[PDB]
A paper describes a structure:
Podophages that infect gram-negative bacteria, such as Pectobacterium pathogen ΦM1, encode tail assemblies too short to extend across the complex gram-negative cell wall. To overcome this, podophages encode a large protein complex (ejectosome) packaged inside the viral capsid and correspondingly ejected during infection to form a transient channel that spans the periplasmic space. Here, we report a near-complete atomic model of the bacteriophage ΦM1.
Using cryo-EM, we investigated the whole particle structure of bacteriophage ΦM1, identifying two decorations with relatively uncommon morphology, and a tail fiber/spike assembly with features similar to the recently published structure of Shigella phage HRP29 and phage T7. An adaptor assembly (gp52) interfaces with the portal and six tail fibers (trimeric gp47), each of which appears composed of long helical bundles much like phage T7, as well as adapts trimers of spike protein (gp39) which may be homologous to those in phage P22, another podophage, and 9NA, a siphovirus. Gp39 was poorly ordered in our reconstructions and was not modeled. However, AlphaFold2 multimer predicts a structure similar to phage HRP29 gp52. The short tail assembly has the closest similarity to bacteriophage HRP29 (16). The core consists of tetrameric and octameric ejection proteins which form a ∼1.5-MDa ejectosome that must transition through the ∼30 Å aperture created by the short tail nozzle assembly that acts as the conduit for the passage of DNA during infection.
Author numbering:
A (entry chain X): 2 to 154
B (entry chain A): 583 to 776
C (entry chain A), G (entry chain B): 2 to 49
D (entry chain L): 1 to 58, 65 to 154
E (entry chain R): 1 to 9, 14 to 35, 37 to 42, 44 to 56, 65 to 149
F (entry chain F): 729 to 776
Write the structure that this text describes.
């Protein structure tokens, strides 16, 4: 609903959106595995309202992928009747659709960004843990095995 | 208001004291009813959340401002029409066992939601609430009464005409005024008359 | 299919079989009014 | 608590009494002990009275509730009569969703680094795939093997 | 942040908003919440104490404030209050304020988890614990 | 007993040269609301 | 489309619902006359 991914074989240059939104400000791009979004106006453009065109490194190397994210306003409701908003069917339908979108974004893990309490996994497993880079990271398998096997002799 | 033996009372901080002459009735199943008394919202329903058994203090629902209010009891306003009939030129009645009723049409001068039940000799056919106020009518606004100056309602029956019973109930702050009633009848003669 | 209309609702209750009831009579009425000019509406409340 | 119920099956469980509240009967699902595949309705469990479940193929059983997330239940058309239940249901759906989410029932994954400010994870489970996390038990018992 | 805030070393200035003063709780040094009357209210926006301090907000979830079926008043303020409560619940569970566990396995999509604590009982281990092999 | 029903009886004879009777001497009632018939008459000249 | 005509305007004001008003009654009249022969015209002025 909220996330789209495209894997390029060596010719990816244009993307056709397949997700809805309220306003264009909610969309962003992150390339593949970087923690910094691509700068609008220098790396991609809005073409009409259905296509996105790349500008820098437009031919994506083989194996790299581009991801699209969505994030709606969460600070306040769009319509507040006490503030002069008229009462119509649309002002209620939009209000409910705003709350639906925030659930759609959260069920896919696109919104959560922290934790403040120890977790209980009840015996379930984590799968894609990445690789450690700092002493405070959670060591994954295939890192202990290599280290242990690398000192057999 | 639409209530019995109602008195006027003042509400402050969403609390007030239950008048003496209603303690006995409410203690025996009678339904307590409250309504606005002034301003544009006059006549609209408001509810309560608790009654202290020792002091008989009542707490109202959230966001009611201080002012004047009425307090009383509820009652019902049942009504039941008579089933239609087929009548020839000379006034004789025919087809008492060979006619089927399809629908009712109701025209209301002013009303809110009401309750309708249609039953047959052995089973229920229709049930549920109906109303003549729609979501696109300018009459529906916040802080105004929920009534429509003119409207219509439709009810399906689908059963033998004379083997039916119909009732319409209303026990709330809104009126129920019936101006006319219409029906759709399915009857088919297959021989001339003489 | 055919249509029709009930003549009126201003003759109160009756208990005869439907074949013989006069025009305007109904089957059950309670806490209503048979008021002319305003129609068959609900009765007002009782004041203390 | 609200959306999840558990029942130990010590040699006797043939029926289960529901303590959770659900929007409609279609949202209930069952899992046997740890299997990721849900039980099949009509062959392993059948509704009895809207508050009891009969078992047909009999450890602990788990019950889950998942409300719809595709739309608001009621769409206010311009020709629909006004009522109160139609608003109550819409306001109830959002509270049900919030109750489900606050318990972590419906989460599925992440697309960002997960931050923890010093807390721990307790029931991580045993890794099988190469790209999994390692428990304290797995590493501690591995040292003994390579320390003969 | 909308639901929580953190202060790092007498007085704490609250920037978040709340419905009632009972929804506010305090914790200290990644601890059981401090029992009020350790801390007490001093005005509507300041807290007086009797390392770092954390504040958490949790609105009611059992019921909606106003139910129109039970006779709730049909005016603008009730709709506004209901919508505000609904938005507050989203602001709360969006940040993972009350999360305490999961019942389904989790996939990290190849990312990494950081700032993990050392294990005592068999669980997940940090890189430092594994690094201390020294055989 | 049945709250509502119907019955059919064949005659096949001259209309006025007939006698019909209905008896009942048991614990059940017999209430007749209406009676209908089928008549076969065919004029073969206009009237005037 | 169809056409029609109001029967008359010589029965003054009424306050019943339109279903029941008699022929000729109107809804509001003020400073008019219900005069026959001359019709429904205005009243003359008052002389000092």
């Amino acid at each position: 609903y909220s996330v789209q991914i495209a894997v390029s074989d060596g010719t990816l240059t244009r993307i056709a959106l397949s997700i809805e939104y309220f306003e264009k400000d909610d969309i962003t791009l992150y390339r593949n595995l970087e923690l910094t979004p691509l700068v609008l106006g220098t790396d991609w453009q809005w073409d009409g309202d259905t296509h996105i065109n790349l500008l820098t490194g437009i031919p994506v190397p083989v194996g790299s992928y581009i991801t699209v994210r969505r994030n709606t306003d969460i600070d306040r409701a769009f319509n507040i009747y006490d503030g002069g908003a008229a009462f119509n069917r649309e002002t209620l339908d939009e209000n409910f659709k705003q709350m639906i979108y925030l659930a759609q974004e959260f069920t896919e893990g696109n919104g959560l960004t922290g934790l403040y309490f120890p977790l209980d996994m009840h015996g379930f497993q984590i799968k894609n843990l990445g690789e450690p880079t700092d002493p405070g990271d959670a060591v994954t398998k295939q890192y202990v095995d290599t280290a242990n096997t690398a000192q057999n002799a | 208001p639409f209530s019995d033996v109602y008195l006027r009372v003042t509400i402050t901080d969403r609390q007030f004291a239950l008048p003496t002459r209603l303690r006995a009735a409410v203690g025996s199943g009678e339904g307590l009813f409250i309504t606005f008394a002034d301003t544009s919202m006059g006549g609209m329903w408001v509810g309560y959340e608790s009654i202290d058994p020792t002091t008989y203090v009542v707490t109202t629902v959230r966001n009611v401002p201080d002012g004047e209010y009425f307090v009383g009891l509820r009652y019902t306003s049942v009504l039941s029409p008579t089933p239609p009939l087929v009548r020839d030129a000379n006034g004789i009645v025919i087809g008492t066992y060979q006619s089927l009723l399809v629908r009712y049409e109701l025209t209301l001068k002013d009303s809110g939601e009401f309750h309708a039940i249609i039953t047959d000799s052995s089973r229920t056919l229709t049930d549920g609430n109906y109303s003549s106020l729609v979501y696109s009518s300018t009459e529906l606004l916040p802080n105004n009464p929920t009534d429509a100056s003119l409207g219509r309602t439709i009810i399906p029956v689908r059963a033998q005409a004379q083997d039916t019973v119909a009732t319409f109930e209303a026990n709330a702050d809104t009126d129920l005024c019936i101006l006319d009633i219409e029906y759709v009848l399915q009857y088919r003669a297959r021989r001339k008359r003489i | 299919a055919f249509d029709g209309s009930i003549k009126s609702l201003l003759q109160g209750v009756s208990q005869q079989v439907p074949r013989e009831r006069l025009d305007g009579q109904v089957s059950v009425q309670l806490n209503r009014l048979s008021d002319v000019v305003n129609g068959n509406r609900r009765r007002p409340g009782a004041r203390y």
